[PDB]
CSV table of N, CA and C in Angstrom, one decimal:
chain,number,residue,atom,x,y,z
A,491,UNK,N,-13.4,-1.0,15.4
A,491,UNK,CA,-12.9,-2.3,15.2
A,491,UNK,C,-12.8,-2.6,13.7
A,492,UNK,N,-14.0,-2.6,13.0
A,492,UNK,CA,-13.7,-2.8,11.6
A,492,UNK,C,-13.1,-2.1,10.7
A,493,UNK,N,-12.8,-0.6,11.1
A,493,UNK,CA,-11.7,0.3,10.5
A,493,UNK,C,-10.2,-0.3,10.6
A,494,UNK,N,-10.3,-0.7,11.8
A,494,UNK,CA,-8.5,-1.3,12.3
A,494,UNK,C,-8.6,-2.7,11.6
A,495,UNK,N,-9.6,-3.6,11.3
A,495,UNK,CA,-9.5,-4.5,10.6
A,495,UNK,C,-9.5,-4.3,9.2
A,496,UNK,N,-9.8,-3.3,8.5
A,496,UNK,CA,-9.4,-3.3,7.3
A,496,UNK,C,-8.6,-2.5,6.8
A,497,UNK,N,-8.1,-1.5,7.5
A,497,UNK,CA,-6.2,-1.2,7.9
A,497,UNK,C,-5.6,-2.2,7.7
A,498,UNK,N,-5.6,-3.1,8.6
A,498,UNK,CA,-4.6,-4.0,8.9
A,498,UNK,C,-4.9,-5.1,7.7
A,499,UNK,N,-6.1,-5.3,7.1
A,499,UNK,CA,-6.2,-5.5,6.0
A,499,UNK,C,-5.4,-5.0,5.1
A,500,UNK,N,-5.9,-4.1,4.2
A,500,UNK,CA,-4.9,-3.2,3.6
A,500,UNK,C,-3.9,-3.0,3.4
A,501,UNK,N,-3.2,-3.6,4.4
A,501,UNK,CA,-1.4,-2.9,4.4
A,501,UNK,C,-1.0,-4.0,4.1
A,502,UNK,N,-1.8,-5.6,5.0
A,502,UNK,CA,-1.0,-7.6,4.1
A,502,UNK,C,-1.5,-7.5,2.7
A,503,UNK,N,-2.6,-6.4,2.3
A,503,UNK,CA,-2.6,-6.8,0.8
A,503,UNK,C,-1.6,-6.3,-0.2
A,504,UNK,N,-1.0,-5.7,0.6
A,504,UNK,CA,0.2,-5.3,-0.2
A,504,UNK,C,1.6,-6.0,0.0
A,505,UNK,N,1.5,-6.4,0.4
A,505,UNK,CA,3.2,-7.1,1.2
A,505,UNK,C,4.9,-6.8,0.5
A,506,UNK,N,4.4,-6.2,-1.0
A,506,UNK,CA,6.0,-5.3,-1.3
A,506,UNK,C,5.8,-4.0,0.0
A,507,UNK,N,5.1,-3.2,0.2
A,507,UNK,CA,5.2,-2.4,1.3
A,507,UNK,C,5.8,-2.8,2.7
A,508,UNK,N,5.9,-2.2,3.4
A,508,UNK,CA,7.0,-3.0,4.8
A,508,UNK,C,6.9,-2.0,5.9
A,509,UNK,N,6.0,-3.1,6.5
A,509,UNK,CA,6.1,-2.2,7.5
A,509,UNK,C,6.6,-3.0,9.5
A,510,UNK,N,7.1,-2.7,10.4
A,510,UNK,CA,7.5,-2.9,11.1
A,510,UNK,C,6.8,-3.0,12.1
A,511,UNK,N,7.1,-3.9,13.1
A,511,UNK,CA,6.4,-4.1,14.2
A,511,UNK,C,5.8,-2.9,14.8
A,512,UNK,N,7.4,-2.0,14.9
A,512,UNK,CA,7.2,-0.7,15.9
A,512,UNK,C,6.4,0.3,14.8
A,513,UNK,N,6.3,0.5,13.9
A,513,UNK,CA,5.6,0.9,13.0
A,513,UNK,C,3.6,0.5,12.8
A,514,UNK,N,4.2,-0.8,12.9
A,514,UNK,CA,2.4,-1.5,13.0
A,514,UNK,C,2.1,-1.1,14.5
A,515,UNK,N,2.7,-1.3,15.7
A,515,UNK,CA,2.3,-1.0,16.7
A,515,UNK,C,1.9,1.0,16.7
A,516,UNK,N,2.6,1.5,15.9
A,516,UNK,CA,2.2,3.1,16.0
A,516,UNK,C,0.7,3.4,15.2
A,517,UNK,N,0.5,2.1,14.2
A,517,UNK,CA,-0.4,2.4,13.7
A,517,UNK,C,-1.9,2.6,14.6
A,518,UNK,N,-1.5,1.2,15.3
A,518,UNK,CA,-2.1,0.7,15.9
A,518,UNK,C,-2.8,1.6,17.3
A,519,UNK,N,-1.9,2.1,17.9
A,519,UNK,CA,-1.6,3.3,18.7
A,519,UNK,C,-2.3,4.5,18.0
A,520,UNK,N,-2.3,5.0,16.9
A,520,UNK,CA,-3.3,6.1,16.1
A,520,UNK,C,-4.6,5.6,16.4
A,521,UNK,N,-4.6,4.2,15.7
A,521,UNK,CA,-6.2,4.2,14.8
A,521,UNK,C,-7.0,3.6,16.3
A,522,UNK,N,-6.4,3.7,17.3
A,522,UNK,CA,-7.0,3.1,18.6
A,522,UNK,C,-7.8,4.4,19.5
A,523,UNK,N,-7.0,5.3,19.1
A,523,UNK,CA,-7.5,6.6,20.2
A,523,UNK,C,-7.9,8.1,19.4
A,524,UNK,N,-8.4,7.1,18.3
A,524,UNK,CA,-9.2,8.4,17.3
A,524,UNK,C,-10.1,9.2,18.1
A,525,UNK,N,-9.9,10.5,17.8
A,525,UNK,CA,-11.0,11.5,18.3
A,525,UNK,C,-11.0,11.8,19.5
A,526,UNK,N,-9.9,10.9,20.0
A,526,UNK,CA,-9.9,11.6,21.6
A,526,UNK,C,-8.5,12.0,21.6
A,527,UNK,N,-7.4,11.5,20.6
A,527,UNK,CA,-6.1,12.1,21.1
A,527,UNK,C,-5.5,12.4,19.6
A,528,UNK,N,-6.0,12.1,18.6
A,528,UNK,CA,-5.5,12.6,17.3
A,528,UNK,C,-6.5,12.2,16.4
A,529,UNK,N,-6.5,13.1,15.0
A,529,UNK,CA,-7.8,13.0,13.7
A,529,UNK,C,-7.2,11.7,12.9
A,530,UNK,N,-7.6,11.5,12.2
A,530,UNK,CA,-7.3,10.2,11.2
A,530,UNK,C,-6.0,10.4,10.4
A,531,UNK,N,-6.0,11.7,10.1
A,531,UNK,CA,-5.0,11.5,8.8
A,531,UNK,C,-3.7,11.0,9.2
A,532,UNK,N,-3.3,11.2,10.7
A,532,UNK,CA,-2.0,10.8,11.4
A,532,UNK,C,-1.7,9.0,11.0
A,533,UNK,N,-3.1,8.5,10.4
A,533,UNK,CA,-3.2,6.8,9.7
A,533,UNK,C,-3.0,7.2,8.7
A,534,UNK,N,-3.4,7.7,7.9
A,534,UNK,CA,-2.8,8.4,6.5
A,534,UNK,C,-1.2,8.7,6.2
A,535,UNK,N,-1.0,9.4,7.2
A,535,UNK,CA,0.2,9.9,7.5
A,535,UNK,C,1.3,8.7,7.4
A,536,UNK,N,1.0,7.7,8.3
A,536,UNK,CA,2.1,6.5,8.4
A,536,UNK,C,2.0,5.9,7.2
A,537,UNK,N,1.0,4.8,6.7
A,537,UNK,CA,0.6,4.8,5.5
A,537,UNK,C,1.6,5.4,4.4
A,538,UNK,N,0.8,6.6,4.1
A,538,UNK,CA,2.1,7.4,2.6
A,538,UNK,C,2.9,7.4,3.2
A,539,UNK,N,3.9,7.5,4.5
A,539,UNK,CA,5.4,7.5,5.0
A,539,UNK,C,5.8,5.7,4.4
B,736,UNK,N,37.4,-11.7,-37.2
B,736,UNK,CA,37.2,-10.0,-36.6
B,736,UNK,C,35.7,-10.1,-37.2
B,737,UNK,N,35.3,-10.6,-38.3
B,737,UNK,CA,34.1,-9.9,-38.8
B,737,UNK,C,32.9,-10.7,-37.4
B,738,UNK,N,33.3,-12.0,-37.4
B,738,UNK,CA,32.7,-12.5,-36.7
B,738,UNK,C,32.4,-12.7,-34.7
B,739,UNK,N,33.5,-12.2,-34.7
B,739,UNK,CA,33.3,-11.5,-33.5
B,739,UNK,C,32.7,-10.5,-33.4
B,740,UNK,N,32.5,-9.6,-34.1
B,740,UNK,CA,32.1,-8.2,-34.1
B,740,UNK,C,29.9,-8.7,-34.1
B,741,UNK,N,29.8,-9.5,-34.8
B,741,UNK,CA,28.6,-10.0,-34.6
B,741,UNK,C,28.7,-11.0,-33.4
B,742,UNK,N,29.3,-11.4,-32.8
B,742,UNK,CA,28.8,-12.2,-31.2
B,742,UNK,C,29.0,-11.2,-30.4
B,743,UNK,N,30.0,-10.0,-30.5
B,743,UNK,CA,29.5,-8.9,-29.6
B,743,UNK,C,28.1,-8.4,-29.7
B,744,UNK,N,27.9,-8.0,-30.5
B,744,UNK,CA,26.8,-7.4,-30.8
B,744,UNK,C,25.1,-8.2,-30.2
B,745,UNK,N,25.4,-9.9,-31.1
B,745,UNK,CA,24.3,-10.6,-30.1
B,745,UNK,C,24.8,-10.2,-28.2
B,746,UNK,N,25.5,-10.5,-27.9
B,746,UNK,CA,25.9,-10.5,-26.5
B,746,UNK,C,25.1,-8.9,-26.3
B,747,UNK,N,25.3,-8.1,-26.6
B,747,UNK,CA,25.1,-6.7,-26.3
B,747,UNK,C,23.7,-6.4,-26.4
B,748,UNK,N,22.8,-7.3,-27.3
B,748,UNK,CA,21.3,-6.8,-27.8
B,748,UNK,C,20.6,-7.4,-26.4
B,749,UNK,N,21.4,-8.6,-26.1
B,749,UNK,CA,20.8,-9.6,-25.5
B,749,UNK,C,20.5,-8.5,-23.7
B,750,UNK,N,21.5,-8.3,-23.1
B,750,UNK,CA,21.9,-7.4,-22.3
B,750,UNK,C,20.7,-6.2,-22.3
B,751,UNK,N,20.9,-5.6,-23.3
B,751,UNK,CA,20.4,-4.5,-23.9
B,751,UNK,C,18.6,-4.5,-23.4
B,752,UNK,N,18.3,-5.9,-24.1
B,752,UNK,CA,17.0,-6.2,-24.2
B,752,UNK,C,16.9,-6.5,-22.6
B,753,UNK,N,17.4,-7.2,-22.2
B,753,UNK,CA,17.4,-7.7,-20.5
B,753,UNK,C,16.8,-5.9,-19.8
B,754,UNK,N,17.7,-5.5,-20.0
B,754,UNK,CA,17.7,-4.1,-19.3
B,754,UNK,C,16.7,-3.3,-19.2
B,755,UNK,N,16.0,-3.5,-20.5
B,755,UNK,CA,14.6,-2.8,-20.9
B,755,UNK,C,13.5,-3.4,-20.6
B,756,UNK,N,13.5,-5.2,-20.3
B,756,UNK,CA,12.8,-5.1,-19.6
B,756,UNK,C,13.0,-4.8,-17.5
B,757,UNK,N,14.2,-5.1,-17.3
B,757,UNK,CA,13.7,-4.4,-15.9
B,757,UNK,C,13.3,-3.3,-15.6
B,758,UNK,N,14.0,-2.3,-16.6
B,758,UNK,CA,13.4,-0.7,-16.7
B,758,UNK,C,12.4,-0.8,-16.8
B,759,UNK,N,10.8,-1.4,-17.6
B,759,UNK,CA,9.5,-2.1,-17.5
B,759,UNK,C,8.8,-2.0,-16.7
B,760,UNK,N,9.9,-3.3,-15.8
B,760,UNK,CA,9.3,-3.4,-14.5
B,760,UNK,C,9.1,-2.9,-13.3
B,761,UNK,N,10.6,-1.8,-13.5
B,761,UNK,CA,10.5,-1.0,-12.7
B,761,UNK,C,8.9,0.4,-12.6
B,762,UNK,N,8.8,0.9,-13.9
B,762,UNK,CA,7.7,1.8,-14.4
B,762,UNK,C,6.5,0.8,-14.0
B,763,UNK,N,6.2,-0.4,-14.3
B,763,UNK,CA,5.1,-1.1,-13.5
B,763,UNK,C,5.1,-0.8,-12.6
B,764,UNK,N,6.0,-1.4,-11.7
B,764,UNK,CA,5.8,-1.0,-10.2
B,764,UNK,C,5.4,0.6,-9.9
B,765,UNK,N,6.0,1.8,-10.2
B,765,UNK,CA,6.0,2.7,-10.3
B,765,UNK,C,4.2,2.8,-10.2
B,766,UNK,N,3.5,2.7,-11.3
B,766,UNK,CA,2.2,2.8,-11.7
B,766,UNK,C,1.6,1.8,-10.5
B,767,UNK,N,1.9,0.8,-10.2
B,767,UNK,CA,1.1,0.1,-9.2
B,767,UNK,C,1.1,0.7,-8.1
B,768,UNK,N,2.5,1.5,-7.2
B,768,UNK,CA,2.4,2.0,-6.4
B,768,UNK,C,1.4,3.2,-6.2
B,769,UNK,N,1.5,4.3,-7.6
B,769,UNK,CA,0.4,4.8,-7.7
B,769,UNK,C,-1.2,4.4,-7.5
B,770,UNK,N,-1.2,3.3,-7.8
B,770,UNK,CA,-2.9,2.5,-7.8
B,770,UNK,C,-3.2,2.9,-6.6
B,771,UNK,N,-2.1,2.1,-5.6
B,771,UNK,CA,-2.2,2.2,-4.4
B,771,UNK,C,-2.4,3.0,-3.6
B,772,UNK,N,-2.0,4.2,-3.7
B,772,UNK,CA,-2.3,5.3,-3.2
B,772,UNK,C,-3.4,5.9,-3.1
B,773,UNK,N,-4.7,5.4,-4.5
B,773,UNK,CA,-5.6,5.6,-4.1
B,773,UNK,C,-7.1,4.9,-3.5
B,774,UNK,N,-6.5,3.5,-3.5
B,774,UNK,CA,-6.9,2.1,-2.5
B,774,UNK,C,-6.8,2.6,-1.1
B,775,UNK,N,-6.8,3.5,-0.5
B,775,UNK,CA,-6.7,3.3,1.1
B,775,UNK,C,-7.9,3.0,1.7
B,776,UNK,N,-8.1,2.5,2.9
B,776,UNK,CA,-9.2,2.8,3.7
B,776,UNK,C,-9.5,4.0,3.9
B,777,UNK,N,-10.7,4.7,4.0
B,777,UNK,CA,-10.8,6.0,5.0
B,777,UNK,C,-11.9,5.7,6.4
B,778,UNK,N,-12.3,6.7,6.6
B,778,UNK,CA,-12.8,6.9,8.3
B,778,UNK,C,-14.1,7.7,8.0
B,779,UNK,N,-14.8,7.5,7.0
B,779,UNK,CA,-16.1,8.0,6.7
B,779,UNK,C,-17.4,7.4,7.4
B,780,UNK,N,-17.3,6.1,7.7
B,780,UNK,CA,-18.4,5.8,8.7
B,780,UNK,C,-18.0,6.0,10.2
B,781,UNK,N,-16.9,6.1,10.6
B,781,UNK,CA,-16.5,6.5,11.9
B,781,UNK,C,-16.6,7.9,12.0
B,782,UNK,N,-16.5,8.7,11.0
B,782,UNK,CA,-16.1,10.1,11.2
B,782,UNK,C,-17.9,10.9,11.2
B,783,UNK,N,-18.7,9.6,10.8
B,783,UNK,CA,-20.1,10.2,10.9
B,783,UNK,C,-20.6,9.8,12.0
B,784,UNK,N,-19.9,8.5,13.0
B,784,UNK,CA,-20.8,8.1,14.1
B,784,UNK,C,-20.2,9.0,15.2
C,491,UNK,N,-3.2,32.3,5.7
C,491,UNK,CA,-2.8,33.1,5.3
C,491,UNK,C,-1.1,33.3,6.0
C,492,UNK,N,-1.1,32.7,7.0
C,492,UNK,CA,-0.3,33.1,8.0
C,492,UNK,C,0.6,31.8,7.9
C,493,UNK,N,0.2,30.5,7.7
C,493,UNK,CA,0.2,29.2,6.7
C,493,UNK,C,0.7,29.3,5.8
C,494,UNK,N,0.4,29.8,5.2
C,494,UNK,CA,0.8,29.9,3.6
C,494,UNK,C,2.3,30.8,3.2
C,495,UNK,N,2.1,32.2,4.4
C,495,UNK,CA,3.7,32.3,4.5
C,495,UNK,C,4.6,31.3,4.6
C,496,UNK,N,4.1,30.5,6.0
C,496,UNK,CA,5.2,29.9,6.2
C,496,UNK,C,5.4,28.7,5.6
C,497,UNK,N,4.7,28.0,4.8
C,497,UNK,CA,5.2,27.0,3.6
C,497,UNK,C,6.2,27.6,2.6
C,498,UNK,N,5.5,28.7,2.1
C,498,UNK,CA,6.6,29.3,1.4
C,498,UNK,C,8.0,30.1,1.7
C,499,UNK,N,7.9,30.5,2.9
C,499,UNK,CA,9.3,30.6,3.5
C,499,UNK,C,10.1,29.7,3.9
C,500,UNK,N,9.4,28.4,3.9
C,500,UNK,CA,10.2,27.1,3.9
C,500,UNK,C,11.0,26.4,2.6
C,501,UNK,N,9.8,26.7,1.5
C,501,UNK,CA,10.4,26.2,0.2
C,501,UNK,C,12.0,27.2,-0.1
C,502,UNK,N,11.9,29.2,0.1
C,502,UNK,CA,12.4,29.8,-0.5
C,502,UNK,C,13.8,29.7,0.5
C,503,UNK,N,13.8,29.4,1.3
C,503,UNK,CA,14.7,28.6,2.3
C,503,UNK,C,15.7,27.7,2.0
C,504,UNK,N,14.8,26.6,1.1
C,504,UNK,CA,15.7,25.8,0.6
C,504,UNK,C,16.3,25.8,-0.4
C,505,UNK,N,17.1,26.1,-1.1
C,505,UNK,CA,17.2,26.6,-2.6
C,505,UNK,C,17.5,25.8,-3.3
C,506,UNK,N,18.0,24.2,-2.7
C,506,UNK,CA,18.5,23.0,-3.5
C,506,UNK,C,17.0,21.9,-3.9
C,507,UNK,N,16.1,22.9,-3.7
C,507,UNK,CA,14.6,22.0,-4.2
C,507,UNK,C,13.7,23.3,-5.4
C,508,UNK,N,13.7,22.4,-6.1
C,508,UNK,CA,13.1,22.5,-7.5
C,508,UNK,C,12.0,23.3,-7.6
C,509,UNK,N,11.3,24.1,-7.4
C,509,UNK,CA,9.5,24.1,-6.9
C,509,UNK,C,9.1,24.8,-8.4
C,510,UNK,N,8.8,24.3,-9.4
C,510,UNK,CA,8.7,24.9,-10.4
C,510,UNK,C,7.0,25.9,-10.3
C,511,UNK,N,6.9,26.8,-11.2
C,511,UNK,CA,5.8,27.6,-11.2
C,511,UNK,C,4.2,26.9,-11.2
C,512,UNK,N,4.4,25.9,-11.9
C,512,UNK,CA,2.9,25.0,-11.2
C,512,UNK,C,2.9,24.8,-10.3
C,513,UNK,N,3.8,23.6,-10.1
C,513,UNK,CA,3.6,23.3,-8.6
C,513,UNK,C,3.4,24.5,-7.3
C,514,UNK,N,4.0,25.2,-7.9
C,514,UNK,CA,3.8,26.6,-6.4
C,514,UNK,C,2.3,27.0,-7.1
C,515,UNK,N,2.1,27.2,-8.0
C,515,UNK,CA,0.4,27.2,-8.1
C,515,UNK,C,-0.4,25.8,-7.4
C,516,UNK,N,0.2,25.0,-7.7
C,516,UNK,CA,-0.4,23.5,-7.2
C,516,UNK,C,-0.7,23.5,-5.5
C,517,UNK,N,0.5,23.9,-5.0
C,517,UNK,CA,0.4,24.3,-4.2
C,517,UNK,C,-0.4,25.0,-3.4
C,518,UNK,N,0.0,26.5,-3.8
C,518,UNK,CA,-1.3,27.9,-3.5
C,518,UNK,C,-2.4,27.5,-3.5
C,519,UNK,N,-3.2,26.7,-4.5
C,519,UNK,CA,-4.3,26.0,-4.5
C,519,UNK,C,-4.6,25.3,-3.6
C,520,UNK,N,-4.0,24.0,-3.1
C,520,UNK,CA,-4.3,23.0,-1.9
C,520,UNK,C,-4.4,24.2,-1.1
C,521,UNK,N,-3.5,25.1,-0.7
C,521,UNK,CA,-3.5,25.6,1.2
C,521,UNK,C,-4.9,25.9,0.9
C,522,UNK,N,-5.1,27.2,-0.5
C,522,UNK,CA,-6.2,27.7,-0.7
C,522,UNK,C,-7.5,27.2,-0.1
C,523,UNK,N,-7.9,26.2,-0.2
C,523,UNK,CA,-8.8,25.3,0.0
C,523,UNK,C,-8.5,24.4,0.7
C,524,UNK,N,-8.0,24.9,1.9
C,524,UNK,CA,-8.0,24.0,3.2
C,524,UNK,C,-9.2,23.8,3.9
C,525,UNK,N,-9.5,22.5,4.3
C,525,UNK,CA,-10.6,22.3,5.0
C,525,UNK,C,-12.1,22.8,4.6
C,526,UNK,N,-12.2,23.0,3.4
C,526,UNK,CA,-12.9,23.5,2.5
C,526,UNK,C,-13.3,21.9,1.1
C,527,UNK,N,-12.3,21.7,0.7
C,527,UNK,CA,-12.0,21.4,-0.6
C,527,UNK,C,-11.2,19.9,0.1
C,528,UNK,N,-10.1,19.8,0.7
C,528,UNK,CA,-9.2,19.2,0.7
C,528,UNK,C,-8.0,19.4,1.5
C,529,UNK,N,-8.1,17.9,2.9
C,529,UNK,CA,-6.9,18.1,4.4
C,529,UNK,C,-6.1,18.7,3.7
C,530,UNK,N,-5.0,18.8,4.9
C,530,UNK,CA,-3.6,19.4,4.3
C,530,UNK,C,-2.7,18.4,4.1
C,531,UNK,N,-3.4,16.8,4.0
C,531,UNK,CA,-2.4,15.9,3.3
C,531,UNK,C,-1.9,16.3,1.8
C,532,UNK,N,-2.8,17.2,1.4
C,532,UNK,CA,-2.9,17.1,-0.2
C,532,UNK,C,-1.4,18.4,-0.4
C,533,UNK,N,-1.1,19.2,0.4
C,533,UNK,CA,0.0,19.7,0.4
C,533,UNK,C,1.1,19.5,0.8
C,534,UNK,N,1.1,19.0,2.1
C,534,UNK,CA,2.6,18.2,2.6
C,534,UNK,C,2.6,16.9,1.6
C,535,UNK,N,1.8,16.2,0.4
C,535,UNK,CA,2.1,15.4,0.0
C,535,UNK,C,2.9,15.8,-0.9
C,536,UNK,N,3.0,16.9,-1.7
C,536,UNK,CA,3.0,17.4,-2.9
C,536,UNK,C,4.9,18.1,-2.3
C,537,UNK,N,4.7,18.6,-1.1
C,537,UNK,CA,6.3,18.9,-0.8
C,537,UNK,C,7.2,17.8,-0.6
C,538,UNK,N,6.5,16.8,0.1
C,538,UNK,CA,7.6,15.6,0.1
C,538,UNK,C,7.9,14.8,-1.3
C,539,UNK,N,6.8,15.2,-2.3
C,539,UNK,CA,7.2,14.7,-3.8
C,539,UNK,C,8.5,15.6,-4.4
């Protein structure tokens, strides 16, 4: 919970970056099912994309 | 003629100057986006629990 | 090792991308030290640069 809170942190402190509903929801979809269905960097991954 | 040749010229520095700074600003941003890249969150107290 | 072919049979593939002799050292290096040293963000970052 406090990783996805400071994700989601992170990405309004930026606000020239842009990111999209369907994009925040993929994030969101990553950082939710860590270690059981994908490693972290797939958050990294969207992020630098 | 002589004096036209000097309001072109203001006209042109002015421009000129304009331009160098958004080129500036652009290389700012450039560098800021770099900052950014190494501001992320990572998954080091998750990836230990 | 088997990796490392196939990045580079990807780059030599493309021939309208730049890969100058550092960076393919830059490169060699990250795979080199995969999972060791540094994920493999540190190389797909460096190809999409």
């Amino acid at each position: 919970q406090r990783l996805e809170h400071q994700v989601f942190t992170w990405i309004e402190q930026h606000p020239k970056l842009i990111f999209s509903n369907e994009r925040r929801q993929e994030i969101a979809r990553s950082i939710e099912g860590l270690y059981e269905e994908n490693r972290y960097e797939q958050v990294r991954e969207k992020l630098l994309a | 003629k002589i004096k036209e040749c000097q309001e072109t010229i203001e006209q042109l520095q002015l421009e000129l100057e304009e331009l160098k700074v958004q080129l500036s600003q652009y290389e700012e941003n450039l560098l800021q986006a770099a900052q950014w890249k190494q501001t992320m969150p990572t998954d080091q107290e998750l990836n230990d629990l």
